[PDB]
Design a protein around this motif. Structure first.
Motif, PDB file in Angstrom:
ATOM      1  N   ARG C  48       0.822  -1.205   0.000  1.00 16.70           N
ATOM      2  CA  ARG C  48       0.000   0.000   0.000  1.00 16.70           C
ATOM      3  C   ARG C  48       0.859   1.259   0.000  1.00 16.70           C
ATOM      4  O   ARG C  48       0.590   2.202  -0.752  1.00 16.70           O
ATOM      5  N   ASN C  49       1.905   1.289   0.828  1.00 12.62           N
ATOM      6  CA  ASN C  49       2.731   2.487   0.932  1.00 12.62           C
ATOM      7  C   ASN C  49       3.575   2.694  -0.320  1.00 12.62           C
ATOM      8  O   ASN C  49       3.768   3.833  -0.755  1.00 12.62           O
ATOM      9  N   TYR C  50       4.081   1.613  -0.919  1.00  6.24           N
ATOM     10  CA  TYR C  50       4.796   1.760  -2.185  1.00  6.24           C
ATOM     11  C   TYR C  50       3.858   2.215  -3.298  1.00  6.24           C
ATOM     12  O   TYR C  50       4.237   3.038  -4.141  1.00  6.24           O
ATOM     13  N   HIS C  51       2.619   1.716  -3.295  1.00  3.72           N
ATOM     14  CA  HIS C  51       1.627   2.159  -4.268  1.00  3.72           C
ATOM     15  C   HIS C  51       1.324   3.641  -4.105  1.00  3.72           C
ATOM     16  O   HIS C  51       1.192   4.366  -5.095  1.00  3.72           O
ATOM     17  N   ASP C  52       1.193   4.102  -2.860  1.00  7.69           N
ATOM     18  CA  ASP C  52       0.860   5.501  -2.618  1.00  7.69           C
ATOM     19  C   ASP C  52       2.044   6.423  -2.876  1.00  7.69           C
ATOM     20  O   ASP C  52       1.848   7.578  -3.266  1.00  7.69           O
ATOM     21  N   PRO C 105       1.455   5.780   8.250  1.00  3.67           N
ATOM     22  CA  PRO C 105       1.950   6.596   7.130  1.00  3.67           C
ATOM     23  C   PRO C 105       2.589   7.892   7.607  1.00  3.67           C
ATOM     24  O   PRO C 105       2.109   8.543   8.538  1.00  3.67           O
ATOM     25  N   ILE C 106       3.688   8.261   6.952  1.00  2.00           N
ATOM     26  CA  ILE C 106       4.438   9.466   7.296  1.00  2.00           C
ATOM     27  C   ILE C 106       3.695  10.661   6.706  1.00  2.00           C
ATOM     28  O   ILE C 106       3.775  10.929   5.505  1.00  2.00           O
TER      29      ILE C 106
ATOM     30  N   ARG F   2      -5.204  -9.044   0.375  1.00  2.00           N
ATOM     31  CA  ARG F   2      -5.533  -7.707   0.859  1.00  2.00           C
ATOM     32  C   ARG F   2      -4.826  -6.636   0.035  1.00  2.00           C
ATOM     33  O   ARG F   2      -5.400  -5.577  -0.246  1.00  2.00           O
ATOM     34  N   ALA F   3      -3.582  -6.893  -0.359  1.00  2.00           N
ATOM     35  CA  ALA F   3      -2.766  -5.936  -1.092  1.00  2.00           C
ATOM     36  C   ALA F   3      -2.718  -6.213  -2.590  1.00  2.00           C
ATOM     37  O   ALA F   3      -1.865  -5.650  -3.283  1.00  2.00           O
ATOM     38  N   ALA F   4      -3.593  -7.081  -3.099  1.00  2.00           N
ATOM     39  CA  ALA F   4      -3.623  -7.349  -4.537  1.00  2.00           C
ATOM     40  C   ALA F   4      -3.981  -6.129  -5.381  1.00  2.00           C
ATOM     41  O   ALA F   4      -3.306  -5.906  -6.401  1.00  2.00           O
ATOM     42  N   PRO F   5      -5.022  -5.331  -5.065  1.00  2.00           N
ATOM     43  CA  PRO F   5      -5.347  -4.199  -5.955  1.00  2.00           C
ATOM     44  C   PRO F   5      -4.205  -3.220  -6.157  1.00  2.00           C
ATOM     45  O   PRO F   5      -4.042  -2.682  -7.259  1.00  2.00           O
ATOM     46  N   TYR F   6      -3.400  -2.981  -5.126  1.00  2.00           N
ATOM     47  CA  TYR F   6      -2.307  -2.023  -5.197  1.00  2.00           C
ATOM     48  C   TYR F   6      -1.028  -2.617  -5.773  1.00  2.00           C
ATOM     49  O   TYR F   6      -0.039  -1.891  -5.917  1.00  2.00           O
ATOM     50  N   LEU F   7      -1.024  -3.913  -6.101  1.00  2.00           N
ATOM     51  CA  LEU F   7       0.210  -4.580  -6.505  1.00  2.00           C
ATOM     52  C   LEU F   7       0.733  -4.024  -7.824  1.00  2.00           C
ATOM     53  O   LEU F   7       1.934  -3.759  -7.963  1.00  2.00           O
TER      54      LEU F   7
END
Lengths: 42, 54, 153, 52, 48, 97
Positions: C48-52, C105-106, F2-7
């Motif tokens: 999630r954090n790498y995506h964001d 998150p930072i 859980r983290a599949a969409p953001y992969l």
């Protein structure tokens, strides 16, 4: 591209400063910029 | 083979470059070179209240 | 009976060629399966954090489209790595607060990332004060330098 | 980072200086293999390099 | 199995790209990581 | 799962972390990397760069704060911003369990 970017010539990276600016006080002072050449928007 | 052999070292070093107090990364500019070298001081990269242990 | 002959022969040849491979693969998968199970909580938040942060680093690269936008403030560097004390280690383990995971998150409210020290052979934990770099001066002719190399600067 | 030539970078095991290319050419070239610092573990310079 | 089928299709179409990824990343990672070795920083060359 | 969409988005950064794959060809023009240098000599920047962890931390940060500079646009004052290690309410971590 990135593999030839750093570490081929020696132990160092390879950085090119086309345009440099100075920030101080809040005015920003520019010394040199490169409008056209190897660094053009693309 | 080489990727698995030499990537974790890269991860460790890129984690060590980052300085929490100033943010971001740190890097210094560079016959082959001058016979003499200098290093005036080492600034405070971290704080006692910022270190966390794995 | 004839179909059983054909099926048995074909399956037998398949299993003879690809049974030892499956057995030893499932034998060698146990340590890595345990490894991946131990670091489960450091997966969802990391992705999630790498995506964001992907768009935030992308805007930095692409705001100009021809170079990189960075702030360069002069800072002092730490002591150069010494030969025996600072050899690399690959014994890193664990995560924040002793267990694998991610921080919150930072934002700008809580800026600094709490530094993490791991079994590596190098650290920048003690740099909590201003001191002069111990190899302050050096020479590259006869290799005679002032100051004493240290891991406790 | 302040300080001048604190570790001197090594040119052993890397591309020779005469083989460098001017920054004008944006043309890519095939990256060589087996390039790393070739010092006998001596000096503070490149302690944690490839060879270690 | 069907969604695995389409994923495997799009991955087999680019197996050669994966091989090239691994081939190049195995032949520049050592040279690139060499920079961050002399200290808690990375060297840079500024030709300007 | 859980983290599949953001992969797929994370693949833009999770392999090469400092760089983003999307903009490599234009920023890096071959051998040399093109970088734009903002040599910022702001009071707060110099305060964080040099006088952090000493007794003169607030000598010039508060000097510039008393000027027209605003805390919102200033790099955060490390002596007061609660990082997750020592933020109130215990350490701030997220654990997928």
């Amino acid at each position: 591209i990135i593999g030839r970017a750093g570490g081929i010539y020696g132990d160092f990276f390879n950085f090119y400063a086309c345009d440099l600016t100075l920030k101080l006080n809040v005015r920003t002072v520019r010394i040199t910029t490169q409008p056209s050449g190897r660094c053009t928007p693309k | 083979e080489t990727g698995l052999h030499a990537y974790p070292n890269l991860a460790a070093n890129v984690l060590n470059i980052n300085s929490p107090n100033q943010g971001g990364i740190i890097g210094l500019p560079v016959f082959n070179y001058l016979p003499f070298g200098m290093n005036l001081a080492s600034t405070a990269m971290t704080l006692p209240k910022q270190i966390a242990y794995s | 009976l004839v179909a059983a002959v054909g099926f048995g022969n074909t399956g037998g040849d398949i299993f003879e060629r690809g049974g030892p491979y499956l057995v030893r693969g499932a034998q060698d998968l146990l340590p890595t399966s345990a490894l991946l199970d131990e670091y489960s909580p450091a997966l969802f938040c990391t992705i999630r954090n790498y995506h964001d942060a992907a768009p935030k680093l992308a805007g930095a690269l692409g705001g100009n489209g021809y170079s990189l936008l960075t702030n360069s403030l002069v800072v002092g560097v730490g002591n150069p790595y010494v030969y025996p004390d600072n050899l690399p280690r690959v014994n890193a383990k664990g995560g924040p607060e002793g267990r694998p995971g991610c921080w919150q998150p930072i934002t700008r409210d809580l800026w600094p990332f709490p530094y993490l020290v791991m079994d590596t052979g190098a650290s920048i934990a003690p740099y909590n004060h201003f001191e002069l770099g111990q190899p302050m001066f050096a020479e590259y002719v006869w290799g005679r330098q002032v100051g004493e190399n240290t891991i406790n600067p | 980072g302040l300080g001048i030539n604190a570790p001197p970078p090594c040119l052993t095991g890397f591309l020779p200086a005469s083989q460098w290319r001017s920054p004008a050419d944006t043309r890519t070239e095939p990256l060589p293999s087996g390039l790393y610092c070739k010092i006998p573990k001596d000096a503070p310079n490149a302690v944690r390099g490839a060879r270690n | 199995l069907e969604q695995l089928r389409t994923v495997s299709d799009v991955l087999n179409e680019r197996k050669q790209d994966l091989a090239d990824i691994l081939t190049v990343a195995g032949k520049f990672i050592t040279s690139l990581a060499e920079a961050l070795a002399s200290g808690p920083y990375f060297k840079v060359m500024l030709v300007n | 799962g859980r983290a599949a969409p953001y992969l797929v988005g994370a693949l833009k950064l999770i392999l090469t972390v400092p760089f983003n794959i999307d903009n490599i060809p234009k920023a890096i023009r071959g051998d040399y990397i093109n970088v734009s240098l903002k040599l910022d000599l702001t009071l707060s920047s110099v305060d964080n760069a040099f006088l952090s962890g000493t007794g003169v931390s607030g000598m010039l940060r508060a000097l510039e704060q008393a000027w027209g500079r605003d805390p919102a646009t200033m790099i955060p004052d490390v002596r007061f911003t609660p990082n997750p290690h020592d933020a109130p309410g215990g350490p701030l971590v997220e654990r997928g369990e």
